[PDB]
Amino acid sequence: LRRELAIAYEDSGIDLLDNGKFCQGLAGADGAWGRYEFDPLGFSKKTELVPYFREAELKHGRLAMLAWVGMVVPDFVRIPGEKFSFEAVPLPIDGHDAFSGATGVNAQILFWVGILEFCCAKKVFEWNSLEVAGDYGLTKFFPSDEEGQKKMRTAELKNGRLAMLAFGGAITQAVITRHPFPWL
């Protein structure tokens, strides 16, 4: 089960002994029909960093899940503004260059993201453990069962990885084709 972060932080820090499980028993290594322990390069053999690896994986998955939808939506709809109009910016891939620099539109996003990351670094480093890796307490809609929680974590990880690859595919295809959503 998942315990409140206050209780979970009681046993937190860089563990030195190793639970003898694949990746310390973390969720996300499960095939469709059986068990799929994917680690060809043996990165999980650094058991002390395994919690950091899971935190980074979940951060990347969530960020790419947002990024893919943010590459899809703008072409269909835009913010009601003159500088966000299709005439000022034809495709999402143009947004970075359009809003970089003195305009500050992307500078504000960078600033707020940096503030959020500065505030979350304490959990990322100090209070990171096998059970609280990627857990910020936003557990609304989280099932109240062990199997349900495990399945939800697996679904998050799988969708995050799918979007992690899909964002690379979509951004590369969009840069290559200069085309609307279908090629991204």
């Binding site: 409140e4 209780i7 009681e10 505030c119 857990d135």
Partner: protein
């Protein structure tokens, strides 16, 4: 029950330094500055900033609305008032007075840290409109802190927006695109 979590950031444990101090209801310190610096110094600086920023906000609002003291040298806008009065000579004298008051504040801080006097971080002995009951005193200290924080943010916004848009204090009739 485990650690005591910060109400501001529920996924972080409250810093023990900011317990029992006014403003602990929020318990906001995700970056852990209270774990590295003395909370007495932190609160003294916070209160100094809040008070100075409240005065600065009210002064900027007043000058932007108008209300200039009688005299020709003061017929300048708030943005250039700093340089105009530095040339005039008001600002050097004001800074001398600030140095005097801050010498006394520095003596207060030093004595507080050395324990010679049981002085609270921002306390200077002023008791005006101060409730007698302890709960009232706590509430008034929290009110001071929150008004000061709001004034810090408000002055930052006011000065930045004024310098950017070249408009008066409300900035409502400003063009942004």
């Amino acid at each position: 029950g485990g650690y005591k979590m910060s109400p501001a950031v529920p996924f972080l444990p409250m810093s023990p330094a900011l317990e029992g101090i006014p403003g602990e209801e929020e318990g906001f310190d995700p970056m852990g500055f209270s774990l590295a610096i003395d909370i007495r110094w932190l609160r003294e600086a916070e209160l100094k900033h809040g008070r100075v920023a409240m005065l600065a906000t009210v002064g900027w609002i007043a000058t932007d609305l108008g209300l200039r003291v009688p005299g020709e040298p003061f017929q300048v806008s708030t943005v250039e008032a700093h340089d105009a009065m530095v040339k005039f000579g008001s600002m050097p004298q004001m800074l001398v007075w600030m140095g005097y008051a801050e010498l006394f504040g520095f003596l207060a801080i030093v004595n507080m840290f050395e324990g010679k006097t049981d002085r609270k971080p921002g306390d200077f002995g002023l008791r005006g409109f101060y409730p007698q009951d302890a709960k009232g005193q706590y509430d008034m200290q929290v009110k001071e802190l929150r008004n000061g924080r709001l004034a810090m943010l408000a002055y930052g916004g006011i000065v930045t927006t004024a310098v950017l848009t070249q408009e008066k204090w409300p900035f409502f009739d400003a063009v942004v695109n």
